[PDB]
Structure formats: C-alpha cells, structure tokens
From a paper:
[name] belongs to the class B family of G-protein-coupled receptors (GPCRs), a group characterized by a 120–160 residue folded extracellular domain (ECD) followed by a canonical transmembrane domain (TMD). One class B GPCR, the glucagon-like peptide-1 receptor ([name]), has been considered as an anti-diabetes drug target and there are several peptidic drugs available for the treatment of this overwhelming disease. The widely accepted two-domain binding model suggests the ECDs of class B receptors recognize the C-terminal helices of their hormone peptide ligands, thus facilitating binding of the N-terminal region of the peptides to the TMDs for downstream signaling. Wild-type TMD of [name] (residue range 128–431) is extremely unstable as suggested by size-exclusion chromatography (SEC) and thermal-shift assay. We have previously described that ten thermal-stabilizing mutations were introduced in the TMD structure of [name] in complex with two negative allosteric modulators (NAMs), PF-06372222 and NNC0640, and we showed that a di­sulfide bond (I3175.47bC—G3616.50bC) and a GCGR mimicking mutation C3476.36bF are indispensable for crystallization.
To study the effects of these sites we made further constructs in which we mutated back single point (C2333.36bM, named M9 hereafter), double points (C1932.63bS/C2333.36bM, named M8 hereafter) and quadruple points (C1932.63bS/C2333.36bM/A2714.47bS/F1962.66bI, named M6 hereafter). These mutants covered the sites where the engineered mutations seemed unnecessary since a di­sulfide bond was not formed (C1932.63bS/C2333.36bM), as well as the sites that affect either intramolecular interactions (F1962.66bI) or intermolecular interactions during crystal packing (A2714.47bS). Besides these two cysteine mutations that successfully formed a di­sulfide bond (I3175.47bC—G3616.50bC), our attempts to introduce another di­sulfide bond pair (S1932.63bC—M2333.36bC) was not successful according to their densities in the solved crystal structure. This finding indicated that these two cysteines may function independently to improve the monodispersity or thermal stability at that stage of construct optimization. As a control, we also measured the thermal-shift data of apo proteins whose melting temperatures decreased by 5–8°C, suggesting that the PF-06372222 indeed stabilized the receptor in each mutant. Fig. 2(b) shows that compared with M10, the M9 and M8 constructs have similar and slightly lower melting temperatures, respectively, which is consistent with our finding that residues Cys1932.63b and Cys2333.36b are not di­sulfide linked. The three new constructs were crystallized in complex with PF-06372222 in the same condition as the M10 crystals.
Numbering used by the authors: 136 to 203, 218 to 257, 1001 to 1160, 261 to 372, 380 to 422
Write the structure that this text describes.
C-alpha cells in the first residue's frame, strides 16, 4: 500500500527523534549532575548533544506546526528549516572537534607533561637548591664546581660539553631520565603496586612526582599512596595538598594533583583551545548556513526551499559538510594507525580513556559521515532509500549511548552514589 508505507516510516522517524531527545536530555543530565564528570571531554559531548537536541526540537516544531495559506508557503517553515540546517552542520563540526580532541589526546603523554613542568635549558645552570641542571630537568651533582659539573655532564652526554647542549641532545637525556624514573618505581616495594593499579594518565602523574622528587622521596607519601591504590582520588587530592611538596612548588603540585583527582590532562590544557572548538562547532556552520538561507530567500523561494534543484545554491551547504566529512575520515584513519601502534607497543591498555573514547568516536565517524561521501555530487528502490530516515532519526540515541550510557566513568558514579545510600 502507498499510504501505509509513508505512515509506517513516519512512526519510526518520530519515535527515532523521541528516543533520541529523551536519551540526550537524560545523558546530558548525567554529565552535568555528577561533579566528577566535569571535564573538557564531557563538555565537548554536551555541545554535541545540544546540536542533536536542537535538531530534534526542529523536527518536533515542524510536526507541531502541521496542526493549524499552507505551511509550505509560510515564513515560519523556512525559519524552522533554517534552524534545522544549522543543527545538521553543527552535528558535523562538533563531530569534527570530537575527532580533533581525540587526536590531540593521543598525542599528549608524560614526555609532553614533563617538558611543560620542567622547561628547557640550553646552558648549565646552578639552581636554587645548589644542584647544577640542564636540558629538561636533568639534575647533575650538588658539588659546587662548574668545572666538575661540565665534566660530569660530558660523561653523561658522550661528547665535550663546553656548556651549550643542543635541543636533540636534551631530548636524548630526557628519554634517559624518564626511563630511569619508571625503572625506579618498578624497583620500589611501595611504588610498584600503586603504579600497576593506576591508569596511564595517573601513572604519568606518579612518574611526574618521581621525576621531581625521587623514587625514595615520593615513597614517603605513605598516607597518599594507599588511598590512590584504593581508587579513592578525591581523598588523596586533599591529602597531597597538606604536603611539603605542595607548599614548596604550588603551581606544579596543583597540576599533578588534578591529574590524580580527575585522570585527565585538563590541568595542562590551554583555555583558548576549548573556545576554538566552540568557534568551530557553532561558529563555522553559521558561516555557510546563513548565505545559503539568504540566496534561497532572494533567488529560490518555493515551498520552504524544498525544491533545491536549480543552481550553485545546493553546493554552498553540501561542500562544507563534505569538507567536514573528508577530514573526519582522515582523522578516522590517522587515529587508527596511532591506536594500533600504542596498543602493539604496550603504550596503551584497552582500559584507558584514550582507547575507550577512540572506541566510540571511531564508530560515530563512519556512521555519520559515510552517506555524505558516497553520494557526494548526486542531487537525487524507493522503500530502500526511505531507510535513511530511520538512521538519521536514531542518530542522537546512538550518540547518547556511545558517549554516556556505556561510559565506564558514569557507571562508577551510579554505583558510588548507590554505595553512599547504603553506608
Ligand atoms: C554499535 C556497535 C555495534 C559498534 C560499536 C563498537 N564499535 C567499535 C568497537 C571496537 C573498536 N575497536 C577496537 N579496536 C580498535 C582499533 F582498531 F584499534 F582502532 C577499534 N572499534 C569500534 C563499540 C564497542 C564498544 C564501545 C564502548 O565501549 N564505548 C564506551 C567507551 C567510551 O565512550 O568511553 C563503543 C563502540 C558497538
């Protein structure tokens, strides 16, 4: 039946956006409700959810305007359609930053963490403590002798020092120091059990302290190390502030403690980067959607601009989305090469955020960007192509699932909340 076909798909479409809207509002409530979930990774999710929520609001508003000159001829329809067009480009660009964020997350590590905290020295320097240092926090000896410090450095570099050491030589010594740090931890009775239990992020925080203080130095934090092993992050965060370490070097300690508390690199992120994501997710769509709207109002205005079959006016909304999809697939491929490298090299376990976030993002990219690429320059079996409306409707639901409901961190919050209720 012809009429039966169009009505049945209308149901699965509206229930698709009904299940998506609900799931996204609930998911967004979860990310906001629990304090522990307040990190840059989840904030990016909340903006991606909003773009799906607003898209659903367009669908419900269009449908709600059917109840009471026709709706096709009205200007209200063109506005709701223009808002819808905005949400779609927002989905694709918030998906872009979702990939860009992931890529940078895979590129940061302990070496990048220490290069920020320790800084870089080109020449030998006698620090406040009496120790001669160079490179990236490479302490030599406390011996008050620049003559012997240069010689002590000569043996530990290979060639004659003179005093000036190149950027490459410093990176070489930097690798030495970090490898020597992890060997210290694993050769310590009090540091191995906790290090083995920490995630890759909180491992870097533990290496960071050993890099500053020392193997036997950080082993003194008996009080903090125990509650770190027990997954009790927040209790250890306040405990680490009551330290000699925190009062001596406060700016560095607060960054390390945040990394312990949250398990993220937020304490090393620049604030302007997240403002550049919000300029891409919400800003760039505005840059091609409004000129599309203007030409389709001055030069092609006929039934909420549904008959988009004339001139270059189709291309100004389809080429920026194609651009977002091509890059999304380029990130898709690049990320996969990085993840399989880090997994093979035992740099990453399948238990880490970087891998689990890749597990979800690598799913959404070909899920949302495949259609746009396959039919790139086609303007426009009937029943079979009617199925695109099913996937686009459920799209928001799947985003809520992969980025919230199956997230391990949120599941911890529900069990931790249920535990408080009993005790
Ligand atoms: C819809 C489905 C049928 C498809 C989905 C499935 N997709 C998926 C699964 C695994 C790999 N994968 C493994 N290794 C690599 C490699 F090669 F290294 F890149 C990729 N890739 C893609 C999925 C499963 C598990 C999760 C998941 O737990 N998320 C929560 C993590 C988070 O968000 O915090 C997400 C998606 C389930």
């Amino acid at each position: 039946s012809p009429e039966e076909q169009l009505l049945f798909l209308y149901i699965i479409y509206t229930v698709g956006y009904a299940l998506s809207f609900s799931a996204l509002v609930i998911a967004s409530a979860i990310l906001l409700g629990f304090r522990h979930l307040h990190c840059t990774r989840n904030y990016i999710h909340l903006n991606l959810f909003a773009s799906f929520i607003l898209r659903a609001l367009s669908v419900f508003f269009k449908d709600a305007a059917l109840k009471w000159l026709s709706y096709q001829d009205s200007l209200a329809c063109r506005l709701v359609f223009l808002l819808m067009q905005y949400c779609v480009a927002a989905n694709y660009y918030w998906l872009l930053v979702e990939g860009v964020y992931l890529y940078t997350l895979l590129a940061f590590n302990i070496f990048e963490m220490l290069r920020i905290d320790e800084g870089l020295r080109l020449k030998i320097y006698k620090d406040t403590e009496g120790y001669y240092t160079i490179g990236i926090g490479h302490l030599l000896t406390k011996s008050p002798s620049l003559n012997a410090a240069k010689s002590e450095l000569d043996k530990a570099i290979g060639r004659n020092t003179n005093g000036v050491i190149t950027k490459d030589e410093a990176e070489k010594l930097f690798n030495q120091d970090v490898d020597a740090a992890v060997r210290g931890i694993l050769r310590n009775a009090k540091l191995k059990p906790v290090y083995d239990s920490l995630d890759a992020v909180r491992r870097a925080a533990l290496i960071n302290m050993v890099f500053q203080m020392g193997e036997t130095g950080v082993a003194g934090f008996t009080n903090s190390l125990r509650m770190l092993q027990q997954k009790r992050w927040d209790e250890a965060a306040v405990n680490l502030a009551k330290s000699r370490w925190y009062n001596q070097t406060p700016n560095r300690a607060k960054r390390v403690i945040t990394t312990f508390r949250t398990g993220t690199w937020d304490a090393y992120s620049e604030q302007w980067i997240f403002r550049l994501y919000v300029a891409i997710g919400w800003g760039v769509p505005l840059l091609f959607v409004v000129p599309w709207g203007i030409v389709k109002y001055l030069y092609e205005d006929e039934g909420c601009w549904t008959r988009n079959s004339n001139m270059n006016y189709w291309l100004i909304i389809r080429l920026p989305i194609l651009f977002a999809c091509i890059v999304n697939f380029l990130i898709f491929v690049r990320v996969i090469c990085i993840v399989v490298s880090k997994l093979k090299a035992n740099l990453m376990c399948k238990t880490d955020i970087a891998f689990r976030l890749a597990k979800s993002t690598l799913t959404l990219i070909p899920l949302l960007c495949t259609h746009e690429v396959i039919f790139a320059f086609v303007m426009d079996r009937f029943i079979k192509l009617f199925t695109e409306l099913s996937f686009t409707s459920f799209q928001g639901l799947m985003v809520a699932i992969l980025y919230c409901f199956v997230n391990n961190e949120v599941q911890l919050e529900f069990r931790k909340s249920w535990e408080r209720w009993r005790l």
